[PDB]
Amino acid sequence: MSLLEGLALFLLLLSGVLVVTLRNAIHAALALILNFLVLAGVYVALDARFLGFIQVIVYAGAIVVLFLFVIMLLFAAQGEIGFDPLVRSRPLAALLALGVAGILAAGLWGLDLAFTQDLKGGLPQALGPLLYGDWLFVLLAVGFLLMAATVVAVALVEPG
Amino acid sequence: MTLAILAVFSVALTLLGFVLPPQGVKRATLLGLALALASLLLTWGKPFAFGPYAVDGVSQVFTLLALLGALWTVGLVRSGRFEFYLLVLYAALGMHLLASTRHLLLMLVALEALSLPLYALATWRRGQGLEAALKYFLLGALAAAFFLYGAALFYGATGSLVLGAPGEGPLYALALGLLLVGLGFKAALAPFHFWTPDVYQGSPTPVVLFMATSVKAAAFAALLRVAAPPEALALLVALSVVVGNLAALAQKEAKRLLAYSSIAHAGYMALALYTGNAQALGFYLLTYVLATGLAFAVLSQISPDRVPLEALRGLYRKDPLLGLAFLVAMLSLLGLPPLAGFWGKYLAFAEAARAGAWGVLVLALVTSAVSAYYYLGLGLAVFARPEETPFRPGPPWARAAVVAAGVLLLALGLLPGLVLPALAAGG
Amino acid sequence: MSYLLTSALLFALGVYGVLTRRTAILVFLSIELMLNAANLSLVGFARAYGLDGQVAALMVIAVAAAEVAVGLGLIVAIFRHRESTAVDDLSELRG
Amino acid sequence: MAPIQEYVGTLIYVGVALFIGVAALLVGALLGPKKPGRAKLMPYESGNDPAGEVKRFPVHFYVVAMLFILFDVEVAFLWPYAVSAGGLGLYGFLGVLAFTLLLFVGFLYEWWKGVMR
Amino acid sequence: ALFYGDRGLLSGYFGLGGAARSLGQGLARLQTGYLRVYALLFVLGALLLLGVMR
């Protein structure tokens, strides 16, 4: 646990700091992919096994792939062009980032939960009846959302 | 069994647009919205729930209003891109799903499903439309991330993602705040108000009609399920109404001024959330939807890109009935007797006083009295000397729609004890 | 519990990104980071409250994919002919 | 299901693969002439301009990747039904069939519109 | 003199209205159009809300 847990958490936070700090868009996306790998390992550690594999497949494997495809079609790696820098906003921004965690830290501080449940691994074997069933309505809503998203992107690019 | 109608029409049209001209697709969309509206009415007093989808008076009323707004905004859209209709359908269905569930996650999926087609409909490709779409999408995804962490902390304070749970102390309050951020952003409550002026100014006028009516309607439909604490509600109302009216004082363009006014009006509607009466808010939103759809239908008859305040002037001489309906709308939104805006405003203030928040109510009333300055500077401008201004005096479509909106506004303002008896279970 | 605190910190980092970044795409990345932090919190509370947060995070993945698709279409349409993706380059709409 | 030891074994697999890859790259890098030249470091094609100064690449690849992310989400939803199939019966089959038909409507839309563009 | 003073009182009412408009345009200046500004003010207001809830 804590031996490798500290490692995973340190890598997670370091990768987030990179993805928000690095100006190389490609390197930021790569730090987020590393973050996704660390997070899929964490997921499996949390007895969610199917979810970690999809997190690698969809999030890293697919989403940031399209991100990279966009930033490679449109170079954009040296983002600092057309600056309007607002330099003083860089520390001020972090201030808000502090608060947005601290109050969360306050809401989660002194919070102890019963972390004892035999999830039996987050395998899809048990998620099938939960998805198609109690979640079938949310599932179909999600499917319509994606179909509409395809149509939206098509009509959005659509040079004609 | 209305959502099924919506889904069937949308999915069939998605392919039928390849064989049907965009005008035929427009007729089809209109038929679907009218059929869904009629199916909603025939189910008045018949709450129907299958899964997390749960229809009560709130779902019924707010989806009726959303369907009205969609019908009206589709009447004007005449572009030869059948997609420019399909998206509208989605939003309606999406907003339906927003008012028809208590499940926080299905609430998020419904929010995304109703909001995404708005991003694409806002592209007349005018350079301002791109800027508006960008601000809208970025701030909306930010609010969706906040709302999602709020649903997560809700699941943390309680084993279910459905509202109404007993609730813990700091963690439940924090989850409530992270939900309220997104919900007030969607309802254009300050200090989340920034996006609304820019988006209303940039988007094509009929789309702004659809937005300022149905989006705010469904947003408050979702808010009514939340048990927002009084301190947060008071802060939102104070900041929203103050900035709304004050920043509207400085506005030089009709659409931006109306967006700030809608921020102030969401601030007013946020009073009925004190009790979650769903009768006060249903009535208020009925009147607001009618009046604002009327005003934006007129503005679309003037100009889709942008309309300054001077363009409104001389409207009575140009078209008498149009100037009269515009005056009715300005006063109803001012909430002045004998117009229904007075009854909606009073019902919200009565809910607020019943909850026992007094100073907030006084500040809201002072800001509403300040609002009369520009409400009159718009309503009374109709009679002024006509200056150079593009004027498209609509088809009989938009004339009849505007007339019906104003007639319903005055009819329900004069005798509100007609429908107000049936805003509960529906006797 | 360290997992939930780390998810909050990743949300905070994404906030810092959204505020600091000049580019639209990097802001969208920071938002995705916020989403993943949310998903981690959901998985922890599902381990606590009985496995529903896993299907929750799945639907969240699908919602994320929809919004990523549509937003990247937007980013394409707005900065295809236009110059640097810098988000400060569009200041037409002023108070 | 499967024991968690297999995943630490997976970590060991990755460790050996990465170690051998880095070893091979060190072998390649250390054993070499190392006489850098200006034109040698130049990318390609005789002075400049393999592709040179060109406008941004076609959006066709963006559309490819976006299609792919959406349909991979589809597959990620189809698999939990694939594992538990006989237990979910005609109800689960019908739900998965309606879901599949929605996203197949999306596919047919993008196909009758096509992306050669 | 009382007539002049009445005119001056009406002028003070005018000044109240003008203060209202000036405050209004100071608050309408809050929205410049730089998306970073809108995001910062948004997050700032949301954090203020979350602090108020205690």
Nearest to A103 among E40, E44, E50 (CB): E50
- What is D4-113's CATH number? 1.20.58.1610
Residues B29 and B49: their CA atoms lie apart, in Å, by 25
CA dihedral C3, C8, C10, C12 (to 10 degrees): -160
CA distance D64 to A12: 30
Q: Is B53 helix (H, G, I), strand (E, B) or coil?
A: strand
Residue in the block written with tokens 């001012």: B334
Q: Residue B300, Cβ neighbours under 10 Å: how many? A: 24
Q: What are B141's two structure tokens?
A: 């995804």
Can you tell me the distance from the alpha carbon of D97 to that of B216, in angstroms, rounded to the nearest whole number?
A: 35
Residues whose CB falls within 8 Å of the CB of residue E16, separated by 6 or more in sequence, listed in order: none
Q: Nearest chain C Cα to B132, which residue?
A: C93
Task: Give the span between the Cα atoms of B90 and B120, in whole angstroms.
Answer: 12
Four-residue CA torsion sign, B4, B224, B211, B145? negative
In chain B, which residue's Cα lies nearest the Cα of E45?
B191
Are C67 and C34 in contact, with CB atoms under 8 Å apart? no
Separation between Cα atoms, residue B402 and residue B325, nearest integer Å: 7
Q: Do A152 and B87 touch (CB under 8 A)?
A: yes
Cβ pair B173, B229 in contact under 8 A: yes
* CA B288/CA B333 separation, integer angstroms: 7
Backbone angles phi, psi at B201, to 5 degrees: -75, -35
Cα separation, C79 vs C87, whole angstroms: 10
Q: How far apart (Å, rounded) are the C-alpha atoms in residues C26 and E51?
A: 28
Chains in contact with A, counting 3 or more C-beta pairs less than 8 Å apart as contact: B, C, D, E
Cα–Cα distance for residue pair B340/B334, rounded to 1 Å: 10
How far out from the chain centre does Cα B27 lie?
Answer: 24
**Experimental method of this PDB entry:** X-ray
Neighbours of B268 (CB within 10 A): 26
By the 8 A CB rule, do B114 and B90 touch? yes
Sequence-distant (6+) residues with CB within 8 A of B262 are B188, B196, B200, B212, B216, B244, B292
User: In this complex, which chains have at least 3 CB pairs below 8 Å with chain C?
Assistant: A, B, D, E
Contact A89 E36 (CB under 8 A): yes
* Phi/psi at D84 (5° precision): -95, 95
Could you tell me which residues come within 8 angstroms of residue B206 by beta carbon, excluding any fewer than 6 positions away? B73, B76, B77, B296, B297, B300, B304
Instruction: Please state whether at least 3 CB pairs lie below 8 Å between chains C and B.
Output: yes
Contact across the interface for A129 and D106, Cβ inside 8 Å = no
B190: DSSP letter: T
Whether the Cβ atoms of residue B293 and residue B346 lie closer than 8 Å to each other: no
* Alpha-carbon distance D34 to nearest alpha carbon in chain A (angstroms): 28
Three-state SS at A16: helix
CA B300 to CA B296: how far, in whole Å?
6
Residues from chain A contacting residue D83 (CB–CB below 8 Å)? 123-125, 128
Helix (H) or strand (E) holding C24: helix C24-49
Domain count, chain B: 1
B425 contact partners, CB below 8 Å, separation of at least 6: B45, B47, B57
Contact call for D108 and B15, based on CB within 8 A: yes
Q: What is the DSSP string of B360-397?
A: HHHHHHHHHHHHHHHHHHHHGGGGS---S-------HH
**Cβ–Cβ contacts within 10 Å for residue D71, how many?**
16
Task: Measure the CA–CA gap between A75 and A83, rounded to whole angstroms.
Answer: 16
Distance CA B122, CA B90 (A): 14
Contact B100, A144 (CB under 8 A): no
Q: Is A151 close to B170, i.e. CB distance below 8 A?
A: no
Enumerate the β-bridge partners of residue B253. B308
Residues contacting residue B32 through CB under 8 Å, at least 6 positions apart: B5, B6, B9, B10, B13, B89
Mutate to test the interface with B, among A108, A132, A151, A154 (most CBs of B within 10 A): A151
Q: Which residue has the tokens 């697999």?
A: D13
Interface residue of A1, A5, A59, A131 to substitute, partner D, most D CBs within 10 Å: A131
A159 torsion bin: left (phi>0), alpha (psi -120 to 50), beta (else): beta
Beta bridge partners of B162: B103
d(CA B278, CA B99): 12
Both tokens assigned to A142 = 């999600």
| Cβ(B318)–Cβ(B389) below 8 Å | no
**Contact call for B117 and A148, based on CB within 8 A:** yes
Q: How far apart are CA B265 and CA B69, in angstroms?
A: 17
Q: Please, which residues 51-110 of chain D have a Cβ atom closer than 8 Å to chain C?
A: 56, 59, 62, 66, 69-70, 73, 76-77
For residue B164, what are the β-bridge partners?
A: none
Please state the separation of Cα B302 from the chain's center in Å. Answer: 21
Task: For residue B59, give both structure tokens.
Answer: 């779902």
* Residue found under tokens 């009768």: B279
Whether C68 has its CB under 8 Å from any CB of chain D: the answer is yes
From E28, E31, E49, residue closest to B180, measured CB to CB: E49
Give the C-alpha separation, B420 to B426, whole Å. Answer: 10
Coil, helix or strand at residue D67? helix
E31 CB contacts (<8 Å, ≥6 apart)? B194, B197, B198, B247, C94, C95, E37, E38
Residue A138 in contact with residue B104, Cβ under 8 Å?
no
Handedness of CA A6, A7, A13, A17 (dihedral sign): positive
The separation between CA B155 and the C-alpha centre of its own chain, rounded to angstroms, equals 29
At B285, list the tokens: 């939103």
Q: Please check whether residue B194 is in contact with residue B186, taking contact to mean a CB–CB distance below 8 angstroms.
A: no
Domain that holds residue B91: 1-427
DSSP state letter for D55: P
3-state secondary structure of A78: strand
Q: How many CB atoms lie within 10 A of CB B391?
A: 15
Cβ(A160)–Cβ(D38) under 8 Å? no
> D114 — alpha (psi -120 to 50), left (phi > 0) or beta?
left
Burial B274-285 (b: 16+ CB within 10 A, else e): bbbbbbbbbbbb
Give the contacts of B134 (CB within 8 A, at least 6 positions apart): C24, C74, C78, C87, C90, E35
Indicate the helix (H) or strand (E) that contains B291.
helix B280-302
Distances (CA, A) of E2 to C68, E6, E15: 70, 6, 19
Q: Is B125 left (phi over 0), alpha (psi -120 to 50) or beta?
A: left
Q: Within 10 A of B266 (CB to CB), how many other CB atoms are there? A: 29
**Token pair 């780390």 in the structure block, residue:** C6
Amino acid at B63: T
Residue type at A76 in one-letter notation: A
Q: CA B144 to CA B108: how far, in whole Å?
A: 7
- Nearest Cα neighbor of B328 from B228, B388, B209, B411 is B411
User: Which stretch of DSSP H or E encloses residue B114?
Assistant: helix B104-121
CA of D102 vs chain C CAs: smallest distance (Å): 14
Give the Cα separation of E48 and A78 in Å (integer).
35
Retrieve residue B19's tokens.
């064989």
E44, E47, E52: best to mutate for the A interface, most A CBs within 10 A = E47
Check the CA dihedral B158-B161-B166-B171 and report its sign: positive
Interface of B with A in 181-240 (CB under 8 A): none
Give the alpha-carbon dihedral of C10, C14, C20, C24, to 10 degrees: 150
d(C-alpha B356, C-alpha B345), whole Å: 16
Listed residue (B270, B292, B416, B232) closest to B349, CA to CA: B270
What does the block give as tokens for D11? Answer: 């970590």
Q: Is A17 helix (H, G, I), strand (E, B) or coil?
A: helix
Among the listed residues B14, B58, B89, the one whose alpha carbon sits nearest the alpha carbon of residue B226: B58
Is residue B422 helix, strand or coil?
coil
User: In this complex, which chains have at least 3 CB pairs below 8 Å with chain D?
Assistant: A, B, C
Helix, coil or strand: residue D51: coil
Q: How far apart are alpha carbons C31 and A128 in whole angstroms?
A: 29
Place of tokens 């501080």: A109
Resolution of the experimental structure, in angstroms: 3.2
**Amino acid type, B160:** S
Beta carbons of B33 and B98 less than 8 angstroms apart: no
CA-closest candidate to residue E42, choices D41, A17, A116, B190: B190
Scanning the structure block, which residue is given the tokens 């009447």? B75
The size of the A-D interface in CB pairs under 8 A is 125
Regarding chains E and D, contact by 3 or more CB pairs under 8 A is answered as no
What's the per-residue H, E or C state across chain B? CCHHHHHHHHHHHHHHCCCCCHHHHHHHHHHHHHHHHHHHHHCCCCCCECCCEECCHHHHHHHHHHHHHHHHHHHHCCCCCCHHHHHHHHHHHHHHHHHCECEHHHHHHHHHHHHHHHHHHCCCCCHHHHHHHHHHHHHHHHHHHHHHHHHHHHHHHCCCCECCCCCCCHHHHHHHHHHHHHHHHHCCCCCCCCHHHHHHHHCCHHHHHHHHHHHHHHHHHHHCCCCCCHHHHHHHHHHHHHHHHHHHHCCCEHHHHHHHHHHHHHHHHCCHHHCCCCCHHHHHHHHHHHHHHHHHHHHHHHCCCCCEHHHHCCHHHHCHHHHHHHHHHHHHHHCCCCCHHHHHHHHHHHHHHHHCCCHHHHHHHHHHHHHHHHHHHHHHHHHCCCCCCCCCCCCHHHHHHHHHHHHHHHHHHHCCCCCCCCCCCCC
Structure tokens at D36: 């850098």
Cα pseudo-dihedral A137, A143, A149, A152, rounded to 10: -90
Tokens read off for B267: 């601030």
What phi and psi, each to the nearest 5 degrees, are found at residue E10? -60, -35
Q: Is B250 exposed, middle or buried (0-12, 13-18, 19+ CB in 10 A)?
A: buried
- The DSSP bridge partners found for residue A78 are A24
Count CB-CB contacts under 10 A for residue E51.
13
Task: Classify each residue of D42-59 as buried b or exposed e, where b means 16 or more C-beta atoms within 10 Å of its C-beta.
Answer: eeeeeeeeeeeeeeeeeb
Token reading at B297: 């239908």
* Beta-bridge mates of residue B101: B53
Q: Are B262 and B285 in contact (CB under 8 A)?
A: no
Find the CB nearest A131 among D1, D61, D80: D80
In one letter, which amino acid is D88?
Answer: L
Beta bridge partners of B308: B253
> Which residues lie closer than 8 Å to B190 by C-beta, 6 or more apart?
B236, B239, B240, B242, B243, B244, B263, B267, E45
Find out whether B292 and B359 touch, Cβ atoms under 8 Å.
Answer: no
Distance in Å from the first CA to the final CA of chain E: 56
Give how far the C-alpha of residue D4 lies from the chain's centroid of Cα atoms, to the nearest Å: 26
Cα–Cα distance measured from residue A16 to residue C35, given in angstroms and rounded to the nearest whole number: 12
Q: Any chain C CB within 8 A of the CB of E30?
A: yes
- DSSP secondary structure, A21-37, as one string: H-SBHHHHHHHHHHHHH
